[PDB]
Structures are given as C-alpha cells and as structure tokens.
Scaffold this motif. Structure first.
Motif, mmCIF file in Angstrom:
data_model
loop_
_atom_site.group_PDB
_atom_site.id
_atom_site.type_symbol
_atom_site.label_atom_id
_atom_site.label_comp_id
_atom_site.label_asym_id
_atom_site.label_seq_id
_atom_site.Cartn_x
_atom_site.Cartn_y
_atom_site.Cartn_z
ATOM 1 N N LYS A 199 0.673 -1.360 0.008
ATOM 2 C CA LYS A 199 0.042 -0.033 -0.167
ATOM 3 C C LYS A 199 0.794 1.362 -0.068
ATOM 4 O O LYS A 199 0.564 2.190 -0.750
ATOM 5 C CB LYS A 199 -1.060 -0.173 1.187
ATOM 6 C CG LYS A 199 -1.848 1.394 1.186
ATOM 7 C CD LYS A 199 -2.558 1.246 2.329
ATOM 8 C CE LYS A 199 -3.627 2.626 2.355
ATOM 9 N NZ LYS A 199 -2.899 3.828 2.719
ATOM 10 N N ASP A 218 0.885 4.119 -2.830
ATOM 11 C CA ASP A 218 0.562 5.568 -2.467
ATOM 12 C C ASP A 218 1.573 6.337 -2.919
ATOM 13 O O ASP A 218 1.460 7.457 -3.557
ATOM 14 C CB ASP A 218 0.353 5.536 -1.151
ATOM 15 C CG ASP A 218 -0.930 4.892 -0.385
ATOM 16 O OD1 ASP A 218 -1.879 4.571 -1.316
ATOM 17 O OD2 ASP A 218 -0.737 4.601 0.720
ATOM 18 N N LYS A 263 -5.420 -4.902 -4.818
ATOM 19 C CA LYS A 263 -6.499 -3.835 -3.822
ATOM 20 C C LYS A 263 -6.211 -2.409 -3.662
ATOM 21 O O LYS A 263 -7.115 -1.509 -3.829
ATOM 22 C CB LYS A 263 -6.486 -4.629 -2.517
ATOM 23 C CG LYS A 263 -7.462 -4.079 -1.538
ATOM 24 C CD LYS A 263 -7.584 -4.863 -0.345
ATOM 25 C CE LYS A 263 -7.696 -3.908 0.762
ATOM 26 N NZ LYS A 263 -8.797 -2.965 0.948
ATOM 27 N N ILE A 271 -6.199 -0.329 -7.476
ATOM 28 C CA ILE A 271 -7.353 0.007 -8.076
ATOM 29 C C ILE A 271 -8.072 1.461 -7.851
ATOM 30 O O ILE A 271 -8.375 2.061 -8.696
ATOM 31 C CB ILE A 271 -8.470 -1.199 -7.964
ATOM 32 C CG1 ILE A 271 -8.032 -2.366 -8.706
ATOM 33 C CG2 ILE A 271 -9.756 -0.484 -8.138
ATOM 34 C CD1 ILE A 271 -8.766 -3.797 -8.473
ATOM 35 N N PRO A 272 -8.107 1.575 -6.519
ATOM 36 C CA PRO A 272 -8.762 2.977 -6.423
ATOM 37 C C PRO A 272 -7.832 4.304 -7.275
ATOM 38 O O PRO A 272 -8.595 5.237 -7.839
ATOM 39 C CB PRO A 272 -8.397 3.272 -4.633
ATOM 40 C CG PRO A 272 -8.575 1.886 -4.261
ATOM 41 C CD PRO A 272 -7.607 1.204 -5.324
ATOM 42 N N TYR A 273 -6.695 4.123 -7.142
ATOM 43 C CA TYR A 273 -6.053 5.015 -8.031
ATOM 44 C C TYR A 273 -6.175 4.890 -9.568
ATOM 45 O O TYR A 273 -6.284 5.790 -10.306
ATOM 46 C CB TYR A 273 -4.561 5.038 -7.511
ATOM 47 C CG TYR A 273 -4.228 5.395 -6.532
ATOM 48 C CD1 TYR A 273 -3.532 4.271 -5.647
ATOM 49 C CD2 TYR A 273 -4.556 6.716 -5.831
ATOM 50 C CE1 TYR A 273 -2.920 4.982 -4.287
ATOM 51 C CE2 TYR A 273 -4.038 7.122 -4.580
ATOM 52 C CZ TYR A 273 -3.402 6.193 -3.738
ATOM 53 O OH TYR A 273 -3.161 6.462 -2.537
ATOM 54 N N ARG A 308 -8.905 6.438 -11.558
ATOM 55 C CA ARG A 308 -8.855 7.740 -11.484
ATOM 56 C C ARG A 308 -8.060 8.159 -12.966
ATOM 57 O O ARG A 308 -8.019 9.277 -13.358
ATOM 58 C CB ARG A 308 -8.193 8.429 -10.433
ATOM 59 C CG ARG A 308 -8.841 8.235 -9.045
ATOM 60 C CD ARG A 308 -8.079 9.050 -7.885
ATOM 61 N NE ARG A 308 -8.211 8.627 -6.791
ATOM 62 C CZ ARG A 308 -7.813 8.839 -5.716
ATOM 63 N NH1 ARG A 308 -6.562 9.651 -5.847
ATOM 64 N NH2 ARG A 308 -7.954 8.378 -4.360
ATOM 65 N N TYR A 343 -15.077 -4.645 -11.810
ATOM 66 C CA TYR A 343 -14.728 -3.262 -12.381
ATOM 67 C C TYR A 343 -15.208 -2.973 -13.912
ATOM 68 O O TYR A 343 -14.712 -1.589 -14.227
ATOM 69 C CB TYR A 343 -13.256 -2.823 -11.939
ATOM 70 C CG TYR A 343 -13.064 -2.715 -10.534
ATOM 71 C CD1 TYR A 343 -12.908 -3.783 -9.734
ATOM 72 C CD2 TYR A 343 -13.658 -1.584 -9.754
ATOM 73 C CE1 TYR A 343 -12.798 -3.860 -8.585
ATOM 74 C CE2 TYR A 343 -13.604 -1.786 -8.541
ATOM 75 C CZ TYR A 343 -13.246 -2.853 -7.478
ATOM 76 O OH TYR A 343 -13.272 -2.907 -6.364
ATOM 77 N N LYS A 374 -16.728 -5.843 -2.727
ATOM 78 C CA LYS A 374 -15.605 -5.925 -4.215
ATOM 79 C C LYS A 374 -14.434 -5.828 -3.286
ATOM 80 O O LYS A 374 -14.275 -5.529 -2.111
ATOM 81 C CB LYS A 374 -16.028 -4.408 -4.681
ATOM 82 C CG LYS A 374 -17.325 -4.606 -5.549
ATOM 83 C CD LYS A 374 -17.147 -3.378 -6.578
ATOM 84 C CE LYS A 374 -18.100 -3.414 -7.690
ATOM 85 N NZ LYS A 374 -19.486 -3.650 -6.853
ATOM 86 N N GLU A 405 -12.275 -3.727 -2.682
ATOM 87 C CA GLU A 405 -12.163 -2.595 -1.998
ATOM 88 C C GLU A 405 -12.850 -2.504 -0.836
ATOM 89 O O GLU A 405 -12.147 -1.832 0.132
ATOM 90 C CB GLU A 405 -12.697 -1.519 -3.166
ATOM 91 C CG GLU A 405 -11.679 -1.144 -4.227
ATOM 92 C CD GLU A 405 -10.199 -1.365 -3.853
ATOM 93 O OE1 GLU A 405 -10.070 -0.426 -2.811
ATOM 94 O OE2 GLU A 405 -9.359 -1.824 -4.434
ATOM 95 N N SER A 406 -14.272 -2.992 -0.847
ATOM 96 C CA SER A 406 -15.006 -2.970 0.481
ATOM 97 C C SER A 406 -14.691 -4.168 1.538
ATOM 98 O O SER A 406 -14.686 -3.707 2.729
ATOM 99 C CB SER A 406 -16.526 -2.888 0.137
ATOM 100 O OG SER A 406 -16.689 -4.135 -0.529
#
Ligand SMILES: NC(=O)C1=CN([C@@H]2O[C@H](COP(=O)(O)OP(=O)(O)OC[C@H]3O[C@@H](n4cnc5c(N)ncnc54)[C@H](O)[C@@H]3O)[C@@H](O)[C@H]2O)C=CC1
Ligand SMILES: NC(=O)C1=CN([C@@H]2O[C@H](COP(=O)(O)OP(=O)(O)OC[C@H]3O[C@@H](n4cnc5c(N)ncnc54)[C@H](O)[C@@H]3O)[C@@H](O)[C@H]2O)C=CC1
Ligand SMILES: NC(=O)C1=CN([C@@H]2O[C@H](COP(=O)(O)OP(=O)(O)OC[C@H]3O[C@@H](n4cnc5c(N)ncnc54)[C@H](O)[C@@H]3O)[C@@H](O)[C@H]2O)C=CC1
Ligand SMILES: NC(=O)C1=CN([C@@H]2O[C@H](COP(=O)(O)OP(=O)(O)OC[C@H]3O[C@@H](n4cnc5c(N)ncnc54)[C@H](O)[C@@H]3O)[C@@H](O)[C@H]2O)C=CC1
Lengths: 255, 255, 255, 255
Positions: free
Chosen positions: A61, A65, A113, A116-118, A121, A163, B88, B90-91
């Motif tokens: 992570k 980041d 995991k 993905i959030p990044y 975007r 996704y 998911k 992510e959650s």
C-alpha cells in the motif's frame, strides 16, 4: 508497438529479473514510466525500483501510494512476482505451502486492492496478472504452486467483472519460459553442468509443439497487448503463451 | 445404488446442513460408515458427527485420527465445508477476504493432507471436493469466494496427479442449489420477506436451462458416483451439476 | 446400478464392438431394452440389432421409427458410432476427411434429429454423446477426427440448451480405451506382434496418470450415470473418463 | 502497429463487410498486401478483392494460386467467412444445417488446405480462424452454427499441432460485434423497426460486462496481434474478444 502505452504509469511486481524484467523493459521501450516493486535490486535499469515484499500489505500500500503521489496516476498494474518450491502435499511443510499461496495469490490480491482506487482515476486502466499454463495442465509435486495459479485466474475474473467497463483485468498463461526460475528448476534436476542443463531444457522444449521453450520477451509482448487499448474489448480472460503445450495429448499416432 | 460403497468409511466436512448433509445422508443410504466434521451440530442424524473446525489443523488431524482408529480405515473424503460473504475487493476487509480463503481452500488442504496417509492404506480411496460452477462462470462482488473455488480446482488436479493410480481426486461444480447458503444470499439481496426471497430464488432458477435451481440430493448423486468404483478411470476432473448454466450465453435468438 | 434404467428403451449406435458393445451390455445388465444401430452384426448378443449406417439419414430415420413402433417409446439415445483414420490436412484426401465428419458428426446429428420427437414423448429422456479427450487435448495427424470430436461437443451443448428441461444431453470424453480401434492404432504403429502391441499400449497407458489405458466398461459406467435420473440436474457437459490425461503437463519436476 | 506485417501477403475470407472488412482494413493500415476472398464485391476498397465461394474448392484453390503467383508468397490467412440461420434441430432442414457446416467449417478447411503448402515456404506463416464466444457459451436455436464454431476450434488446434513450429494457427472468439450479421439477428427477432432493433442491440450490450457490444476493429486488433511476430510463441489457442461475456454467470448477488 502499442503507442497508447507511451508516458503511462506502469507498475510491475517482481521485475528485477526473468519475465518481470522483460515486461518492465518492454514497457520502457513503449515509452511508459515503469516502476518495479520487488525484493531485489535490478541494479542499473531504465525503470524505477521500490523495495517491496508483496506479502506485506502495508508495504505494498505504501509503495503504491508513493507512486501515485510521485507520478500523478497509475494506468497499468502487472502482477508478476511469484515463487515455486516443489513437494507432495505430504512432504512440503504447511508453512512453505502457505508461503507459496501468500506470494503467488495474496501478493496479487494486495497489489490489486491498493492500486485499483488510483487506477480508476485514470482513463482505461488495465491489470495483467501472470498465471501459468498450469492453470490448465499441471506438473507433479507442485501442489501449492498449481493451486495458487488456478486461484490467480479466479481473482482475475472477479476483478474484471467487478470493475468493467472502467478497468479491464486479464491474465497471461505461459508454459516453460527461459528464466532464472526455470534454469533453477533444471539445475535442481540435473546439476550445474551447462551442458546437462541445456539438455534438460531442450527436453522440455521438445515437449512443446513449438519445439523450444519460450523467451521472456514473448510473454512481455502478450502483456503489452493486453495492457493496451488494442485489447479494449478483452477482459476476464487468460491469453496462453505456451507454444501449444496446453492442447497437446502425449499419445503417439501413426506417421 | 453403488454396492461398493457399503461398509466404506466416508468423511464429509460441513455435513450439518445443506449440500453436506444431503451427501452424508446419501452415503448412509449406500450403507457406508459416515462421519461429519463440522462446527455445527446436525442434531438427530443417521450419521456420526464430530465438532471440528476445518481451519484448525490440530483439530482436523485429531478428528481424522479418531476416525481411523475407531473405524479401521478411511476410503472417501468429501471436502464440502465452505462459506461466502460479499464485497468488491475494495470494500471487504482483508481479514474477511483471508477468512474465506482459509475455510474454502485451506480447510480442503488440511483435511486432504491429514487424511491421505490413511486413505492410501485403504480400499479404492477417493477424494471429492465441492467447488462451484463459479470455477468457470462467476458472480459479481464475490472476489474471495470465486478465487477460493478456482483454487479448489487446482488443489484437486494436483492431488489427482500426485497420488494416481492408488487414489483418485475429483471435484463437483454445482450451480444454484436450494440450501441455507443460497437462502441467505437471497435475503442479503431482497430482504427477509419470505415471498420475495421466493421470487428471487425462482428468478435464479429460470436463469438455468433446467428452469429451476438444483436440489442438494442431486449434488449428492454426483458425489456418490465419483466416490464409487464406477468412476474408477475418472480423476482430476470437475463434474458440473449446473442444470446447464455454464454453457448458456445470455444472448437471445429468434424463436 | 441405476434402477431407473430398467425396462427403458435404449438405442446405442455402433454397439457391435468396443465401447459401444460395452455400453449396450451395461444397459442390458441394468434391465433396459437395448437396440444397436450399426453396420456390423454383433452376432449372439443379449440386445437387439438393426443394420444401420448412421451416415444415411433415411435409414437412421427408418430404424428409429421402427424401434418406436416396436417398443412403444425411446428413453435414451447413446451416439457412439465413430471412425478414425490418420493424416495431415495435406495428405488425407478431401473425401476421407469429409467421410470422418460424416460418421462422427453427422451420424450424431441424424440419430438425434430423428429420435428426439419420440424421446420427448417419454419421461425424462436423455442423450449421451461419445466425444473424446481430444475435445480438449489432441493428437497429431488427426485433423478430421479432432475436428469432429470438438463438433460433437457443440452439438451436445445445443441439444441440451434447446430441449431443457424436458430432455438432457451430455457427452463422455474418454482418453485411451482398450478397444478394436485402439488395438488397430497400435498395430498400425508396431505391427501384429502381441508382445510389441502390449508394449505400445503400455506406453500409452503410462502417459495417463492412472498408469494404464481405460476399459470399455469404465466408459459404460459414465454413460449409464449420465443417462440415469442420478444425473437429473446435469446437462450440456462432458464427463471426462481419461485417467487424468487432460490435466497432465508433460514437463518433469524434481522428485 | 506491428512493423513485421509490412509487405506481408494477407488473405482474408469474407472481407466484403463486417468483421472481415475491418480485418482487411487493419492489415492494409499495417502496410500488408491484402486480398479478400468473398462472394460479395466490397466495391471501393483499399484492398484487393476476388470473387470466391469458400465452399467451392476449385475456386478456392485457383484464387490462392493467383495470389501466390501474383504476390510471391502468402504469410497470413484469416478464415472469417461465415453464415448463421436459426432453428432447433427439429425445424431446420437437413440441407440448411449441412450448408452452415459447409460454409463455416469446410470453408476454413478448404482455404487452409490449399494455402498451407504456400505458406510454409513463406515468412512467419500464421493462420487466424474466426470462431465465436459460442465455442464456449452458446445460444438457443443455433445447433448448426454452434456446432460449426466448436468444429473450428478443433481444426485450429490440429493445424497448430501438425505444422508447428514453422506455422502458427490460432482462433479469435468474439462475442456480440456490431455487424450486418448481428443487425440481421436482431431484425429476425424484433422486426424491421430501426429503433426497436436499436433497443435489442442495446440489451445484448448490457449483458456483456463491458456494457456494450464490440466493434469490428476490436476483433481486427486481436487478429493482427496473433498474425504478428509479437505472438511468436502463441499457437493452438482461442483469444476471446468478448467483453467478459464468457466469464459472467447470470446470477445476481448483494450490492
Ligand atoms: N518461468 C516460467 O516458465 C513461468 C513463470 N510463470 C510466472 O511468471 C512470474 C515470473 O516468473 P519468473 O520470471 O520465471 O521467476 P523469477 O524467479 O526469475 O522472477 C521472480 C521475481 O519475483 C520477485 N519476487 C519473489 N518473491 C517476491 C516477494 N515476496 N515480493 C516481491 N517480489 C518478489 C523476485 O524479486 C523476482 O524479480 C511468476 O508469477 C511465475 O509463477 C508462469 C509460467 C511459467
Ligand atoms: N448452495 C449452492 O448453490 C452451492 C454450494 N457450493 C458449495 O457447496 C458446499 C456446501 O454449500 P452449502 O450447503 O450451500 O452451504 P451451507 O452454508 O448450507 O453449509 C455449509 C456447511 O459448512 C460447514 N462449515 C462452515 N464453516 C466451517 C468450518 N470452519 N469448519 C467446519 N465446518 C464448517 C457448516 O457447519 C455447514 O454444515 C460449499 O463448499 C459451497 O461453496 C458450490 C456451488 C453452489
Ligand atoms: N477407443 C478409444 O480410445 C476412444 C474411442 N472414442 C469414441 O468412442 C466411440 C467408439 O469407439 P470404439 O469402440 O473405440 O471403436 P470401434 O471401431 O471398436 O467401434 C465402432 C463401432 O462403430 C460402428 N460404426 C462405424 N461406422 C459406422 C456407420 N457409418 N454406421 C453405423 N455404425 C458404424 C461399428 O460397426 C462399430 O460397432 C467412437 O465415437 C470413438 O471416436 C473416444 C475416445 C477414445
Ligand atoms: N458479428 C458477431 O457478433 C460475431 C461474428 N463471428 C464470426 O465472425 C465472422 C464474420 O462475421 P460477421 O462480420 O459478423 O458477418 P457478416 O455477415 O457481416 O460478414 C460475412 C462475410 O462472409 C462472407 N461470406 C459468406 N458466405 C461466403 C461464402 N460461401 N464464400 C465466401 N465468402 C462468404 C460474406 O461475403 C461477408 O463478407 C464469421 O465467421 C462469424 O461467425 C463470431 C462471433 C461473433
């Protein structure tokens, strides 16, 4: 090459040698900004490197980041870091069996995991997971390894379905490829004699319809293709780079 | 029935309810000596029950030792215990994700690991692992579950290859079956309303070519077949008990 | 055995020898009324026989119409008649290539097409098609044969989807089985010496994880299972009876 | 782009419209010398066209001879010509059923058969066969079509195995793609109303995880990749360009 990859941020795990190094170098040739996440310093390389053990979710992570902050985005993640040790379910210690699942499956789960959030975007992000031809046809005394590679296919399908259409996720399933892991496997069977090692590798190569084992750059081409917009309608699948191994029955016929 | 199953010692994990219970009941009907290894007490049952958490190796090993010493052999092991929660990548918390892998995959690994040394000394040893139709076609928000079911297939193939010809190992891949797990799935989606849950289940049934969901006994039939001598040349495969679900494309055609 | 098969009318094509004869005999043992449709007289057999070339749709239709009139129903159809000749796409004549597709695929299409209308007039009718492990892993110089066996899987899925839930249709995918066809294949490679023929067959058997080739009765058990109500929720699939052949990669690992 | 495709002679069957046309156009963009073999005239086109019925071997052989003599080599053959009509095995005439097999399978067989002797004398020969996602998950009332697409996979694997390592052969398995064939499919189902056809197509798109149907150019990208040297260790496989359709179970889960 795949022009669309130029300047995009690409993270490749286990890119300090073998297939991963080949993948990283291909993306560099494509003009991408590449960062290796591994536990070995590739030394003088055209790509960036961050010391990172994929079995440590906190380090994974933190590394991701950091990459997003430094580069501004993450468009492609190639999960490649993996290990293999041999043993029957009765001989391998439970610890070693679990360790193989930890690196080979959980490493892919953690990197995915946190990236993905990044990635969502960015425009049309893509994840490519390196599985194995052993997600279909398997070897003996490789319980943990085989289990982990089948698991990687499930994770790949899940990420793809969860996704889509924003992000795509596919796997590459290579058969025998000329890398440190394979050279090591040969030595474990025949010793250090380069002559005997070549004979062993030649034997394996002759088992593949293509009559040779694959080259790291050949796996890299498949990864680059799946990571690119050239594969815009491809998601949730495994592209086999196996020289035809998975479709060959070892039963002779009259010639 | 399969006459060879009579008097054979059969271990079934997670047999206190649902598919597991139906499997244990079928083997009892075949005249086998059946023992359930599960965390919940099935209560009044035609088969033996032992309180056992499949994720606790000390407990699994001791239960298997007790069975072999008491019965004199172990001919069949049916790995069935499993769980499912949704989210998911992510959650869902990493802890919950790991737990699903622990029960669904490591539980099969521990039971197989400790039973195998005993089984290979027994008659016509056979292991049947319950995977899922999701080892092929998958659902959304089920990353851990899907990964675990694909992993089970790899474990199955490796045990099959490493212990043939003395012991056979196969998997059964069921689609939607009427069980508490499926009842819970519907509830988590449409609420506790009984008639609405009924509607949800009916909908899933209509998605299967057979136009209904499966019954636990139908999975048990496949398991009994694979455990029997009737399947003497069948190893390393998954028998799909899916009412045709895995071969159906959701694309309409002219009628 | 599968009690539900008793007294039911079962048609088996190519049941005058090999796997087909084994299938017919198993159904006879189950108490079924069996009729062979083939181009060879099995001689003294406990089952009925009608001279019938499966590539002749008119003869196939007439034979099936006759069976329905004589017996009153048709509950199970086992498509098994098949041939194999060897040759590269460049060496085999177009005529021979087409002939293999005619027997192996069109024979199944004709028998199915004419039996279905009658079968749906019975309770829970079932069709079982004999494909091959070569629907997945294939042999060299077997272009037409391999193509035909893949085609059989498509036909199987289509029939299953088109007629569910009334009628089920599945395939059996055997690897090397001890039959005239296989004994012939061995002779074509090593000659008529029973000693050299056994060595060749032993070689093939050692390529299978089970360390032997299969027996016709083992394929018959799978067919009986799929034809029975024990497989009530199984449709559109292929049950591999391959001794583990299709999951084995021919790459050695350290032992 | 793939620089190795420049100046390579590429034959594409059924390239007068739809996917075939997009494939021919992509190779023209790659600098290849492209020739379309089809029954319909594409009219104004950047590639050459030859009137050719793929079910007529005399015509196929002559067209391929003309291409080799005029161009000096044949490096890539893309078998794409195909048709589809609907009906259950009971309603479709045997003649129409056989015709679909003739165009979809025998057409690929004839073109491959006559092109191979020339291709093996050329540089990096590669054959790409267009199958369908229906080689895996299928639709109703499409018996002949589905059978033909499964057959194509068998043909693909056999050519791959019989001609490796000199020539590679792979298939592409597309799901719903925007083409006249798909437009016809919708019309035959919902009528000629343009806005209703639009709704039907949208519905199919929403069934794909990517939430839209594919574009012909997306299939062409996969074909160009497999024909290129970038796929040098890829043979005997099917690359699914299905927007995730084949890995999706139509079963809802909690959100
Ligand atoms: N070599 C072959 O024939 C095949 C390889 N594969 C897969 O391809 C991938 C790469 O394989 P190879 O290049 O052959 O092996 P390799 O051993 O040469 O390279 C492995 C890379 O993984 C990294 N790594 C290992 N454990 C790590 C950890 N805990 N954290 C971070 N990095 C870690 C290493 O530093 C190294 O750079 C693996 O997933 C392997 O399973 C799949 C099929 C065949
Ligand atoms: N119900 C369905 O539609 C399908 C079920 N399956 C699989 O079939 C198996 C049985 O599923 P169901 O009967 O539906 O579910 P269920 O929830 O009704 O039954 C699960 C059983 O697992 C046991 N169990 C759970 N965690 C355990 C642990 N840590 N130690 C020991 N026992 C434990 C429980 O005591 C219970 O008897 C599972 O592996 C499931 O993934 C596969 C496909 C479909
Ligand atoms: N023997 C093996 O290892 C395997 C066999 N199979 C399949 O199993 C089936 C049976 O194979 P075998 O028993 O080995 O071969 P076989 O040659 O011993 O038996 C074939 C049967 O087909 C009948 N037959 C052939 N052409 C016919 C026609 N035009 N009309 C009517 N009947 C016809 C023959 O009379 C004979 O009874 C075939 O579909 C074969 O492809 C699949 C995998 C492996
Ligand atoms: N459109 C879709 O969603 C999918 C298409 N496919 C396959 O892709 C291929 C192309 O399909 P489409 O472009 O959609 O259809 P289309 O109908 O638009 O194009 C078919 C082409 O085939 C040619 N053709 C037909 N019969 C011929 C014959 N006897 N000789 C020579 N040429 C002949 C036509 O001239 C035409 O150019 C086919 O093999 C089809 O089965 C596979 C999956 C999905």
């Amino acid at each position: 090459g795949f022009s669309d990859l130029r300047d995009k941020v690409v993270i490749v795990t286990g890119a300090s040698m073998g297939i991963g190094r080949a993948i990283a170098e291909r993306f560099v040739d494509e003009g991408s900004k590449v960062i290796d996440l591994s536990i070995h310093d590739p030394g003088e390389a055209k790509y960036d490197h961050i010391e990172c053990d994929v079995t440590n979710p906190d380090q994974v992570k933190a590394s991701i980041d950091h990459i997003f902050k430094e580069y501004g985005s993450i468009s492609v993640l190639v999960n490649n870091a993996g290990i293999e040790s041999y043993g029957k379910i009765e001989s391998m210690s439970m610890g070693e069996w679990r360790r193989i699942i930890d690196v080979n499956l959980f490493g892919y789960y953690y990197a995915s995991k946190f990236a993905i959030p990044y990635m969502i975007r960015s425009r049309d992000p893509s994840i490519v997971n390196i599985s194995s031809v052993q997600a279909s046809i398997i070897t003996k005394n490789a319980s943990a390894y085989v289990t982990s590679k089948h698991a990687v296919i499930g994770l790949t399908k899940s990420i793809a379905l969860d996704y889509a259409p924003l992000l795509r996720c596919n796997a590459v399933c290579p058969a025998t490829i000329d890398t440190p892991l394979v050279r090591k496997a040969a030595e474990l069977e025949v010793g250090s004699d380069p002559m005997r090692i070549e004979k062993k590798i030649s034997e394996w190569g002759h088992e593949h319809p293509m009559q040779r084992i694959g080259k790291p750059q050949e796996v890299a081409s498949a990864v680059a293709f799946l990571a690119s917009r050239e594969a815009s309608f491809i998601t949730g699948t495994c592209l086999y780079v196996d020289g035809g191994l998975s479709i060959r029955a070892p039963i002779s016929t009259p010639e």
